[PDB]
Amino acid sequence: LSTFPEADTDAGTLTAQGSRHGTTQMGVNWVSEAIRTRPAQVGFCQPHN
Amino acid sequence: GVGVSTGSYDNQTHYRFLGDGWVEITALATRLVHLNMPKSENYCRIRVHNTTDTSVKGNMAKDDAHEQIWTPWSLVDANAWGVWLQPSDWQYICNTMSQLNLVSLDQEIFNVVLKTVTEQDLGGQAIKIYNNDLTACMMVAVDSNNILPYTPAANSMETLGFYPWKPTIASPYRYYFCVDRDLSVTYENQEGTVEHNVMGTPKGMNSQFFTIENTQQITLLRTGDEFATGTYYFDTNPVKLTHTWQTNRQLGQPPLLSTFPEADTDAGTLTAQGSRHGTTQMGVNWVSEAIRTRPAQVGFCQPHNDFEASRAGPFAAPKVPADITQGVDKEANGSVRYSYGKQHGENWASHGPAPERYTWDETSFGSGRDTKDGFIQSAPLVVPPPLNGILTNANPIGTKNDIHFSNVFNSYGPLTAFSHPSPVYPQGQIWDKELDLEHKPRLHITAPFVCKNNAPGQMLVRLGPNLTDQYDPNGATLSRIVTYGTFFWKGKLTMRAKLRANTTWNPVYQVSAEDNGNSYMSVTKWLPTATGNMQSVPLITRPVARNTY
Amino acid sequence: PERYTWDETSFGSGRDTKDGFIQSAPLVVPPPLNGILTNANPIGTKNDIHFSNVFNSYGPLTAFSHPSPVYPQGQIWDKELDLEHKPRLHITAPFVCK
Amino acid sequence: DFEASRAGPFAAPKVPADITQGVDKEANGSVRYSYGKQHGENWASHGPA
Amino acid sequence: HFSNVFNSYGPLTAFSHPSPVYPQGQIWDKELDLEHKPRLHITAPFVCK
Amino acid sequence: GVGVSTGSYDNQTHYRFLGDGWVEITALATRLVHLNMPKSENYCRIRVHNTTDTSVKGNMAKDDAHEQIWTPWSLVDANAWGVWLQPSDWQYICNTMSQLNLVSLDQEIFNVVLKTVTEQDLGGQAIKIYNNDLTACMMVAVDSNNILPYTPAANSMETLGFYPWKPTIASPYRYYFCVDRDLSVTYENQEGTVEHNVMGTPKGMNSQFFTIENTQQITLLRTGDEFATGTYYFDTNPVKLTHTWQTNRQLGQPPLLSTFPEADTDAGTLTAQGSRHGTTQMGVNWVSEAIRTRPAQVGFCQPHNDFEASRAGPFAAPKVPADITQGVDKEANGSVRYSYGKQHGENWASHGPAPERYTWDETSFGSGRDTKDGFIQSAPLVVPPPLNGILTNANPIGTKNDIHFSNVFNSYGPLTAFSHPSPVYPQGQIWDKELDLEHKPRLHITAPFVCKNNAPGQMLVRLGPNLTDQYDPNGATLSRIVTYGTFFWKGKLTMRAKLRANTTWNPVYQVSAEDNGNSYMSVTKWLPTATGNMQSVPLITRPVARNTY
Amino acid sequence: NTTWNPVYQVSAEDNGNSYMSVTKWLPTATGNMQSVPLITRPVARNTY
Amino acid sequence: QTHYRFLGDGWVEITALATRLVHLNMPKSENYCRIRVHNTTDTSVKGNM
């Protein structure tokens, strides 16, 4: 994160998604926590009932 | 003592052929890491919540809201391929070898220097005086028992630099604290409300605050001190440096052809489908290449661009990488996209703040899935099928037209046989700790060499606190004299590789470096410019093919 | 009898069914109406069957923990099935006899 | 289902299983053979099939 | 219908491997050279290890 | 040498199970103590006399008038529980263990650095230049023979900090000189005079001036020097980590009941009191639970809020801690109140100058005394007693109404059996030197582990005097170049604990960490905030119960 | 014990409306025991 | 009772012992008999699979 919280209430803003590093599986040119590449899926979606 | 060196710079890679086509590659790396003092030396969790992207309707994939314990420790993580091997060495261990394996790893910190900055003017404006510091210490606790969370620095592209003649930066250590996220799914400009954007309070069960002090045994390195970790012996599995080309329609004996081509242009007609031998899975009385029985399915159809959600917000399901097939689908096969920085293989002459991106096309040509040319017929096979007897990739699933059946079809079965993806050059990741779960995944899509027993030790370094005379251990301002330091890091990663066996008649594919031009392998890339601006672009890992079956 | 729904403590491998979705193969953010399969669209004619009832996302890199031993009314062991290819776990006993 | 990856459409190989009372020889993957005359056909079969 | 798209192969699916078919069967088969191998072959009971 | 480190940071705690339910806890602590130069380097006694609180009528309890020899030495005293164990370790050595004992203790000073400050301007206003100092010394005399007065620094809450990632302060050593105080007792706004507020001149018999130089053997530590004390082996008694619940009316066999309850709501009636067996101490011909003969009294009635006075002014009599019982009396049972500072477990975000206070409620439920529901009957027992035949807690003793009989009643007898109070977490005190008196007290209300033979050595540290060129050993100004220093301290306290034996059917009480909220055990306390503000609140020491008799 | 904060523990709470009241695992006035399920994995572990 | 027998470096040997008084009654009949259970009172209603 580029900015840190001054008080104990607000949140620290990360680096902007356009100029951010990492890997993704999608073709878009921004990295977020959702589309970021992880080692393995943890819980599988099973067909229920 | 203070005026003597406690180490030796060494960066070369040695090939040590040790009998019947076995190589012992001993890659050595050495950099000058530049440690700066932390922002604050307190452990603090900072919840990140972006209600500027996520509050807009339809931005669940633009969500990176989480919580992190921010430790005041920096992490020396050499877990990329470009740290050890130069680009002329990923050409020798790709054209010539046929299998790579990891053997050991030992790291060392030496030639530590710490120095403070002071202010003087000399012209009416303040300049810095970089005064030396002979009694300050550096704290170098390595985590060989793996109690702390595993943060591989090749995820945020925060490893050591790939050029040995540059000073690098140490990445700050921070890990994930577990709070609950609740985001509601929403399509684009929906006439409604988001209704769920809440971040949760810390739960009592799954809350882990890990201090580096209470868990590790820290070594205080002064100016004349060195540190050395013992050789960590790997227990991984060998990846192959030969790509596969046989798809599911090229497994087994080809059908015997009754007529042969006279000239070199026409094709030989096979035996007619009515009176043809073989086995099928369908009930029809004709055998073709499509419906013929094969030993195993090679590439599985994975549900692409799906976003699961469980107690931490929506995240994309990790797809196994595969080949794009002629209708090119870089997202439906899971081709990894990189966003590496300027010390990891960008052009140094790029003035812009944006990183350089590269979509990694996987070389395994057999296990790839053309999503637009797949279909599903009815349970009694009729050829040609009617309109209501085939599910093509033009029919809508649900109300929405843009979601066809290839987005929901998960054809991973009990006889799916795929190869594991290739080690990506420079900005790859060499190893990864296997997850502590009771049933383990078959692979990791971030590292070729998953450690079977224990990960190598994370080397955490920080600067010891230098205090002024005014200090109060009650409510203070933390004056803290402005210190920094540089230290040399030297690692040795031993590898073991098997040489190739030339069996084919035709010349095989080789990663040759072409002339200057518009090609991908022009030599002008891996060569410094007139002001010395190197760039390191990825190389092909598996040039030569191998026979699957 | 007395009934009790056993909530599993493994918080990582859990799936919120109403807040999962599937976008189109070229990723566009924010997606349009016909470019996302949410948990409000009907699968088939029937409205009450959404895509989370038919989606089986068990893949080759699914890593989950095996469920916990339930106290008193659990079951300690179970005989492994005599089939030629065996299941990965039993949902009735923590200790499958090898 | 007919998958397609760089070599044309091919059927996904189903694990064989029992047909159950509504008989589905294709939904369970019952293998169909097309053996010739030296592999267990009636030798008196004059036909080419 | 939904049985054509439903893939219910899960982490606790326990099936037996199919039988050796008489005369026109196949006794052995070479295991594929892939980095992650299939669980069975639907053409041969005895996959050579 | 000067450019090499002479020690190793280590802070973890090791559990070393050594057979039949015996643990060997080896707690390690390490901090960075910040030594500053003394105010003056002369020994001086400073009589403190507050004739602004004590001259007011009725403020004998607001008196802190005394005399102290103020030595120019600072004291490194790690005599609190929070120095050694982290709060996740006072949960393991309270839920799982059943008995704790102290085994050894060894301390070490290393990585000493001393540096001076100078002035430069650079902007027209003076700033400091923290210049190094390679030839100044640090004097680290430990007192292993116990000749000096024992000043435990856990009394003024002046021990080392409980968070290992913070620099601490060394507390200045000062002890009590013996002068006579004479204060007259006075009630509130009495129409009279105080008449006695005199502080006495030094007596000839009991006057002890103790210099650290003439009694100890001092080690001069330079920058490259270390110091190590040998392992002091403790000889204490084990405290139990299981609380007692049986009061005096729950000792022995319960009376056999003639009728049993049919439903689950009503109670079973006992045998009638006229025809009942057993023994009593009274002369009446009926046995009840109240007047039945028991083996020993469990909790004694101590005279609470009494102020004795002998040659040094009024002081409160130390009460043995006990449980508050349903009419809650935190003062009548002697529940200790703490006033810990900001480096000892206050919220760091507390902007105020006031400390954080906590009344420690004792967990021993059996030996507790409800003062309002106790009474004394006449010597021939008549039930029910008349008005002049019972001394309740509503009758006045003396003229004053607010002093009832429970303030003067001291029922400590020859068969009073109580448990010793629990070790209070972080801001407790681990050991205490037993008094040198000819007849010793049964316990100490400040420490669970009273040392039976000899206390561990007080580690006294100071800075060696750095002088300017202008120096006169006659009447001087003591110029004394402005020096400070930091040194690392590392102690190891070995403990020994016995694991629990689960005998009961129901689940026992456990110190579990609850979810975030308004509970006392929310996890948000033992977790750093968004700017890193830790707080350490006390934990329950004896969760599980034990059977007294 | 590796963490700094106190970990979750299956403690038996006081009598009331909580799930872990001690009145459950205790016989009544006529001896009517009940055994309700307990949490098996209180303490957390680090997956990766 | 249940015995805990700590046997070195953090290894416990739990030896749980159980004992009850089982009350055996004579069987309904001492013949082996297969009893087909078929509920055409719930299953014949529409929608009760």
Nearest-by-CA chain H residue for F18: H8
Residue B523 DSSP label: T
CA–CA gap between residue F514 and residue F242 (Å, rounded)? 22
Residue B348 DSSP label: T
CA–CA gap between residue G9 and residue F96 (Å, rounded)? 11
Are B437 and G47 within 8 A, CB to CB?
yes
CA–CA gap between residue F154 and residue F175 (Å, rounded)? 14
F518 belongs to an annotated ligand binding site: no
Mutate to test the interface with F, among H1, H2, H6 (most CBs of F within 10 A): H6
The DSSP-derived string for B192-249 is S----EEEPPPPSSS-----STTTSEEEEE-TT--EE---EEP---PEESSEE---GG
Chains H and D, touching by 3 or more CB pairs within 8 angstroms = no
Phi and psi at residue E17, to the nearest 5°: -80, 145
CA–CA gap between residue B181 and residue F144 (Å, rounded)? 57
Nearest to C83 among E6, E7, E16 (CB): E16
Chains touching B, CB cut-off 8 Å, 3+ pairs: A, C, D, E, F, G
- Name the one residue in this structure whose structure tokens are 């062991």: C77
Beta strands in F312-421 (DSSP E): 314-316, 337-340, 356-359, 376-377, 390-391
Here the tokens at position B282 are 């369908």
- Considering only CB atoms, which chain F residues are within 8 Å of B475? 342, 348, 350-351
Q: Are F241 and F93 in contact (CB under 8 A)?
A: yes
Nearest to D26 among B283, B298, B369 (CB): B283
Question: H or E element: which one contains B84?
Answer: helix B81-84
- Considering only CB atoms, which chain E residues are within 8 Å of A44? 10-11
- Name the one residue in this structure whose structure tokens are 């060989």: B144
In total, chain C counts a number of residues equal to 98
Q: Are B42 and A5 in contact (CB under 8 A)?
A: no
| Cα of F325 to nearest chain G Cα, Å | 16
Question: Which residues are registered as beta bridge partners of B23?
Answer: B497
Q: Are B153 and B171 in contact (CB under 8 A)?
A: yes
What is the Rg, in whole angstroms, of the alpha carbon atoms belonging to chain G? 15
Instruction: Count C/G contacts: CB-CB distance under 8 Å.
Output: 19
Q: Are F435 and F443 in contact (CB under 8 A)?
A: no
Q: Are C59 and B320 in contact (CB under 8 A)?
A: yes
Q: Are F481 and F118 in contact (CB under 8 A)?
A: no
Burial C48-58 (b: 16+ CB within 10 A, else e): eebbbbbbbbb
The DSSP-derived string for B68-115 is EEEEEEEEE---SHHHH--TTTTTHHHHTEEEEEEEEEEEEEEEEEEE
Nearest to B219 among F8, F120, F161 (CB): F8
| Cα of H32 to nearest chain F Cα, Å | 42
Nearest to G47 among B205, B211, B436 (CB): B436
**How many Å separate Cα C33 from the centre of its chain?**
27
- Considering only CB atoms, which chain G residues are within 8 Å of F266? 29
What is the Rg, in whole angstroms, of the alpha carbon atoms belonging to chain D? 16
CB atoms within 10 A of CB B440: 17
First and final C-alpha spacing in chain A? 43
- Name the one residue in this structure whose structure tokens are 């109060």: B472
Here the tokens at position F409 are 């009643």
Are C60 and B300 within 8 A, CB to CB?
yes
Question: H or E element: which one contains C97?
Answer: strand C95-97
Nearest to F513 among G5, G12, G30 (CB): G5
Alpha helices in B443-522 (DSSP H): none
- CB under 8 Å to B263, separation ≥6 — which residues? none
Nearest-by-CA chain G residue for B454: G48
CA–CA gap between residue F85 and residue B243 (Å, rounded)? 55
Query: Gaps in chain H (C–N > 2.5 Å) come after which residues?
Result: none
Here the tokens at position F473 are 């050993």
Q: CA B158 → CA B170, B172, F249, F463, G10, distances in Å? A: 8, 9, 69, 44, 41
- CB under 8 Å to F451, separation ≥6 — which residues? F234, F235, F236, F431, F432, F433, F434
Residue B138: helix, strand or coil by DSSP? strand
CA–CA gap between residue B271 and residue B255 (Å, rounded)? 8
Residue B254: helix, strand or coil by DSSP? coil
On the CB side of F403, how many CA atoms lie within 13 Å of its CA?
11
Here the tokens at position B414 are 């009990």
3-state secondary structure C9-73: CCCCCCCCCCCCEEECCCCCCCCCHHHEECCCCCCCCCCCCCHHHCCCCCCCCECECCCCCCCCC
Which residue, F463, F424, F459, F464, is CA-closest to F445?
A: F424
- Considering only CB atoms, which chain F residues are within 8 Å of B134? 2-3, 132, 134
Pairing type for strands B66-76 and B458-463 reads antiparallel
- CB under 8 Å to B264, separation ≥6 — which residues? none
Q: CA B264 → CA B254, B260, B267, B268, F492, distances in Å? A: 20, 10, 8, 10, 87
Burial B108-139 (b: 16+ CB within 10 A, else e): bbbbbbbbbebeeeeeeeeeeeeeebbbbbbb
Q: Does a cis peptide bond (omega within 30 degrees of 0) precede residue C30?
A: yes
- Which technique? cryo-EM
On the CB side of F98, how many CA atoms lie within 13 Å of its CA?
12
Mutate to test the interface with B, among A6, A28, A32, A42 (most CBs of B within 10 A): A32
| Cα of B311 to nearest chain D Cα, Å | 35
What is the Rg, in whole angstroms, of the alpha carbon atoms belonging to chain E? 14
Are D10 and B247 within 8 A, CB to CB?
yes
Question: Which residues are registered as beta bridge partners of F102?
Answer: F495
- CB under 8 Å to F474, separation ≥6 — which residues? none
Q: Are B48 and A14 in contact (CB under 8 A)?
A: yes
Are B417 and E44 within 8 A, CB to CB?
no
- Which one-letter amino acid corresponds to residue F295? P
Q: Are B298 and B418 in contact (CB under 8 A)?
A: yes
CA–CA gap between residue F538 and residue F85 (Å, rounded)? 13
Mutate to test the interface with C, among E3, E6, E19 (most CBs of C within 10 A): E6
Dihedral sign for Cα B46, B51, B53, B58, please. positive
What is the Rg, in whole angstroms, of the alpha carbon atoms belonging to chain A? 16
- Considering only CB atoms, which chain C residues are within 8 Å of E15? 83-85
Here the tokens at position C74 are 């659990």
CA–CA gap between residue B445 and residue A4 (Å, rounded)? 32
Question: Which residues are registered as beta bridge partners of B308?
Answer: B315
Q: CA F476 → CA A45, B110, F462, F469, F479, distances in Å? A: 84, 49, 22, 13, 8
Burial of residue F516, with CB atoms counted within 10 A of its CB: 0-12 exposed, 13-18 middle, 19 or more buried:
middle
Beta strands in E1-49 (DSSP E): 28-30, 46-48
CA–CA gap between residue F376 and residue B406 (Å, rounded)? 89
Nearest-by-CA chain B residue for C14: B310
CA–CA gap between residue B371 and residue B300 (Å, rounded)? 11
Here the tokens at position G36 are 């309700």
Which residue, E9, G23, F523, is CA-closest to B412?
A: E9
Chains A and D, touching by 3 or more CB pairs within 8 angstroms = no
- Name the one residue in this structure whose structure tokens are 């985590």: B143
Dihedral sign for Cα F295, F299, F300, F301, please. negative
Here the tokens at position F140 are 């680290």
Give the CA-trace dihedral at F273, F279, F285, F291, to 10 degrees: -70
Here the tokens at position H20 are 């009850």
Residue F406: helix, strand or coil by DSSP? helix
Residue D32: helix, strand or coil by DSSP? strand
Give the CA-trace dihedral at F469, F473, F476, F479, to 10 degrees: 30
Q: Are F283 and F380 in contact (CB under 8 A)?
A: yes
Question: H or E element: which one contains B92?
Answer: helix B92-95
Residue B94: helix, strand or coil by DSSP? helix
Here the tokens at position B146 are 């793996």
CA–CA gap between residue B220 and residue B137 (Å, rounded)? 6
Are F531 and A8 within 8 A, CB to CB?
yes
- Considering only CB atoms, which chain C residues are within 8 Å of B184? 19
Resolution (A): 3.4
CB atoms within 10 A of CB B437: 20
Q: Are B381 and D11 in contact (CB under 8 A)?
A: no
CA–CA gap between residue F130 and residue F312 (Å, rounded)? 46
- Which one-letter amino acid corresponds to residue F278? G
Residue F405: helix, strand or coil by DSSP? helix
CB atoms within 10 A of CB B263: 5
The DSSP-derived string for F76-143 is E---SHHHH--TTTTTHHHHTEEEEEEEEEEEEEEEEEEEEEEEE-SSSS-EEEEEEESS--EE--EE
